[PDB]
Amino acid sequence: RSPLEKASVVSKLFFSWTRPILRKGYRQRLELSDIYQIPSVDSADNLSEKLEREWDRELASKKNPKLINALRRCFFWRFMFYGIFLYLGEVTKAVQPLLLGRIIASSIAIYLGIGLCLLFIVRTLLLHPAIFGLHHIGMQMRIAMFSLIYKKTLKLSSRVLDKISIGQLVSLLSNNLNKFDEGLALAHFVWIAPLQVALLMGLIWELLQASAFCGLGFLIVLALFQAGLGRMMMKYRDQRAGKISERLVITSEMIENIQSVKAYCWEEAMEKMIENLRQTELKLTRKAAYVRYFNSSAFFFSGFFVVFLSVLPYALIKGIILRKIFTTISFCIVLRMAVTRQFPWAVQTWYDSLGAINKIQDFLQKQEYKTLEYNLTTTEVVMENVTAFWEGTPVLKDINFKIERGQLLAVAGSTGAGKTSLLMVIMGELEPSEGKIKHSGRISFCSQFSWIMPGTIKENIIFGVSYDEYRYRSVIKACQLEEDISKFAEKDNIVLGEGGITLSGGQRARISLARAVYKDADLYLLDSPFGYLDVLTEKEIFESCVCKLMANKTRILVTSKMEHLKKADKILILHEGSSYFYGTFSELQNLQPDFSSKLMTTWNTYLRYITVHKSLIFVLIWCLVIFLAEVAASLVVLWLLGNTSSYYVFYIYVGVADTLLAMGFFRGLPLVHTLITVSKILHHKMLHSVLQAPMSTLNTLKAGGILNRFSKDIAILDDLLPLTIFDFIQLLLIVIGAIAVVAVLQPYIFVATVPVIVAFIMLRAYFLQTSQQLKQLESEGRSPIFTHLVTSLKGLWTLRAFGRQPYFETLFHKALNLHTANWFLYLSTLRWFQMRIEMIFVIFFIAVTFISILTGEGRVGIILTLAMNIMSTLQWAVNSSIDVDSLMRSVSRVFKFIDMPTEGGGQMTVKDLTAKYTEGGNAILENISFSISPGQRVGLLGRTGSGKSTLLSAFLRLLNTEGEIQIDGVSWDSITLQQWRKAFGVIPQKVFIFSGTFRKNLDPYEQWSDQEIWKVADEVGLRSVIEQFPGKLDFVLVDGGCVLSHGHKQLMCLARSVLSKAKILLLDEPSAHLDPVTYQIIRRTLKQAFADCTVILCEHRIEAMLECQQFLVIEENKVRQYDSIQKLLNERSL
Amino acid sequence: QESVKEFLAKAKEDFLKKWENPAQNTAHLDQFERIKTLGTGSFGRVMLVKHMETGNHYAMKILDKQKVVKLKQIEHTLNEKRILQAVNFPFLVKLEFSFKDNSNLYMVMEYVPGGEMFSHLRRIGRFSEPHARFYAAQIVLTFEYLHSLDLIYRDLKPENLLIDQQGYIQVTDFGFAKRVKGRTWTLCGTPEYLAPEIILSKGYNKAVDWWALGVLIYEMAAGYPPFFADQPIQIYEKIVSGKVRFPSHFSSDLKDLLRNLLQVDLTKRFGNLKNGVNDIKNHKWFATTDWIAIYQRKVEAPFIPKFKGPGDTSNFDDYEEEEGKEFSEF
Ligand SMILES: Nc1ncnc2c1ncn2[C@@H]1O[C@H](COP(=O)(O)OP(=O)(O)NP(=O)(O)O)[C@@H](O)[C@H]1O
Ligand SMILES: [Mg+2]
Ligand SMILES: [Mg+2]
């Protein structure tokens, strides 16, 4: 199926089979169906069975279960086969400069140039085809490990299942989701680097004989310096993490409570608090970035020292021919590449891989759930003196029962305090230490909190079984599912989404009942099934399925209804962990009659990004100016000298382009500092904008869709982006300077370099489209794995009790294959692009080398010296450019966020009121008109329970509403919303208290005197409540003010409203959240202090609002009116 | 070792003499009864009878002379008679007397009142792991003894295993047993347990029965044949594929043991590389087993079928009743 299986050897070597996808995608949008079929070797089942067989052979062979010892005999030979070619492809690069050192002899030189070309041609084909194979091997290990971990996730016992955290598994799984696959190209350098440096040191000894350790020791100490700076960076990052946490919690708090801040008009307050929190964050980030810049610039600077120190001692004693400089420079840069970056990367990769493998090994040895010796045959299910602990505390007090084949017992008592534990013990989920519970083994459970697997209702009720027409029809009709099906969208195959949110609680109960009744079993332990249905619905279900069909076979229901126990063939009442009463129906009913009665990437995004700060353009033009000045100086000195030992020594400066074009410490720092300031400015502006968006627009944005732009985009903008763009600019600057230097020294190079740049741009633009499309497809193809994992972790109990694990295993394998197709295809196309870029560099090198040799001693030496070693910097620059293009999406999204437009006497009058949730939805009010009496309460009656929050929100103009409002003789248009909203006071159902001291939590503006605040608090009756707080008022209300009670929070909100001296108090749900003592105290306080406010109490109960003078009736699309109870109770409510 | 090797050598020496002097026509069809037909079988019939002179019940086999010639099955029964007259082990049905008549041939064998183990497996569905191990130990022991006798069973399916009063397995139906020294060639048996070597129509080695044991273990521990298909031709393709899908409730040790007993590679097949049976007998899945007690029947059986007297036929199925140069040594 996959085109890899049908491909020529040349195509497999040149990656020619990836052409058609690039051909199609660049011109049209990809469809997910266009992804190639996975190779049959990469199927999840094929790798899972192999690794599982090796792992269980390891388990049954020795008493030292090393998982790596099982991975070895699987993958070691292919690993080594690819490593050998990697070693050869590194050795050819290391030994190439020996040919250059002989080329400088000038006839014979043409053959040497051809040989120099041959080495590059061979290296182009000996490196990438092995790197791709290593990546393939990594993908295989990742797939097999994921499949094994999932296959073991359905075997743990509940004894260890509940102990682990939910997030542990997802953190472990996602920790190495991409690290393992790309963490193999650097794996072999744990033994290629030492042999490389040994060969190189020997060869340079064969040219110096006196000075070899001098440069190697310098490289070593530089390497330890670079490694040691990492701990300094890590300490600052760890310090910054907690501060990011404490800032993000407050940001999330205000994101959740946006409407409360909008009503209170607290935007500038939180602006100030957020900036104050972020200042120290910026300080720490700047320090860490400075450390990172120093570490990065050290490698770029050391390129000159590492050769100067090596050359100096031999230079002083003997004179040196120019050959032994142009050769040692190349050997030295190769050694620096080989010992400064590759080896520590390999060590880090090995350490991380070993850690992850040991973690997986530890996980695969947890306590395992054991299936009961079941499915054979059994008489009446009998339990004799079963005693076990729900965790020492025996949840079962030597219970005993025996239900004949067909009888329907009914356990009763407190929920989950012995009924659920007994049901789990019977199901075998909990092992009983004492007693022997015998059962037929076919048990179909139905948990109180039913779980609905993603898919159609038919899929959630079939459970991988046939759709028997009579059985399914009877199940639908009896369990009240026939009417639901008739009301369903497709009415037979309504494809529900994940989570079951589209279904109601009664729908979930019906689904659970259908699932329980579908399976034919000798025991149907339907536990608390009727706990979410109507009384008439419960009676219909009992007369239809529970006591009509499910009573034919053995069934043990658990209900607290008195009528339900009447039809039971046996009764076992348990309470406080002990069986208070047990026996037959009549025997237990007459055992105690008294007790029985008691029981019952565009250029626009770029230029906008730079133009946010004028200092950025200044520093960039400064850096460019110093660059062109220094390249001009180097070019003029080269021309002067090429057309006393120090005269020849100065060539070492121009020979290594790294140091000659290195970004000075006086130039790199302003760039990073300005980028950090730009990120701060952008974050502040986006926070300012998001706090003024219209509510209707905010409703279109999901709550979780805004916090991510704060928690992830800002971190990317601060940490990853600055270093990435700095590295890209430095690398591009080095490349352009070096190529200009080469071109000037020989003016015929330019005609060859121009097509090279043209082809570079063309190829990059061609590859970018497919790369980004595949990246997005892979990213969107990864959610189902975690969604299914969470769903299975929630449904584990029902899944195991039913006994349908292979269905879930096959589903997970299908999802894994679906993601693997995208990942493998993207990896292949990336390797194709890398190889093509290597080939174009190779042909450019051919051209420059031949034109140089065909046409002095310094000329050719310098040209070839830069020519051979530009390649690493060029490849690095291209990769950095692709990475910055990948990172630009965060800036694009933040800029999408920033450009969001803003929203725009006691007697009051309202008219022509029209409101809706969105722009053009259902009219909440249809020209509703009312007049506000001065200081007289107007109860909110009429359409109680139909939803009055919309009217309350529109009273403050916090929704998509239009009309005319005349409060105190002033229209709603002339008065500014900031000024108008302050006059009106509201009492939301949920009280928002800022996480901080009482003075800050109650006075965010802090514009009131402390003595006045204390006097107001004493007058509000909260002085006694505040007296129990730590200190006097500095007790920080951490965790969103969870210390205070709901009544205390309501009292604090009322006191805050009184402090603002609002002209109105639209109290809503007074007694709904208040305790009887709290409600009485609140009512007394409102009567005493808030008597002069035109309050409007909102409550569903008519009696609660009957105390108000006026009674503003409500009705669908028409606000009725009955100012007197003499007609309100007779017409409005009757 | 030591005692086991000496016992095997003594058994081989004794069996050589028995194979040297087989008997014939030890009884006539005049001292038996026709109480019930225990079962027909492949192409014959078996009826439960009692000794007229003694009173002890003995099973009697019946085979049609015309059917043997028509089916080209003459040497197999001749060799099976000698094998039964020469085999001597606790786990094999003991034959008492043989009869030869001008109409049909008869032979007297000891009766096991426990019935077929296939019915028990089908009614119960599947066994627990220790229960399956208890039978696997006996099967491995009798296969050890039979291989030490330079013979091949080649036909091991559940309905050919019986249970006695003490609860141990007695192995019957030696009709397909052949004493082969070297590579065999004859194709026969049951499609379910047809080993990959026999399916390819090649010289079967002594490891052909190892695949039968590895399939019987899976069938006893799961409840369905590990290799199943609609048609024998399709079943042949499935067996040639050699891919097995283990259930979820299988333990790791059994998952390891079954893989070696069912590997397609003849060289790496368990019980054939170097040890013969010593690898299997020392495996972790068999660690908790008293083989010395198993040989002496000193361990209580985890299952005792309900015996209701010598004449009881409750466990056995009830289905109606019944009313020259080729053979010269019967
Ligand atoms: N010694 C015995 N005691 C009790 N039942 C027996 C005995 N020998 C046979 N039977 C039963 O009689 C039935 C038929 O006899 P059997 O030995 O199986 O002939 P068969 O044709 O060669 N068997 P097969 O080829 O596998 O189909 C068997 O299914 C046994 O259950
Ligand atoms: Mg038969
Ligand atoms: Mg038989």
Numbering used by the authors:
A (entry chain A): 3 to 108, 118 to 402, 437 to 645, 844 to 886, 910 to 1121, 1125 to 1173, 1207 to 1436
B (entry chain G): 13 to 335, 345 to 351
Task: Quote the study on this structure.
An example of a protein activated by PKA is the cystic fibrosis transmembrane conductance regulator (CFTR), an epithelial anion channel crucial for salt–water balance of the lung, intestine, pancreas, and sweat duct. CFTR gating (opening and closure of the pore) is under tight control by its regulatory (R) domain, a mostly unstructured segment containing 10 consensus PKA-C phosphorylation sites. Phosphorylation by PKA releases the R domain from its inhibitory position, permitting ATP-induced dimerization of its nucleotide-binding domains (NBDs) to open the channel. The PKA-C consists of a small N-terminal lobe (N-lobe) and a larger C-terminal lobe (C-lobe) joined by a flexible linker.
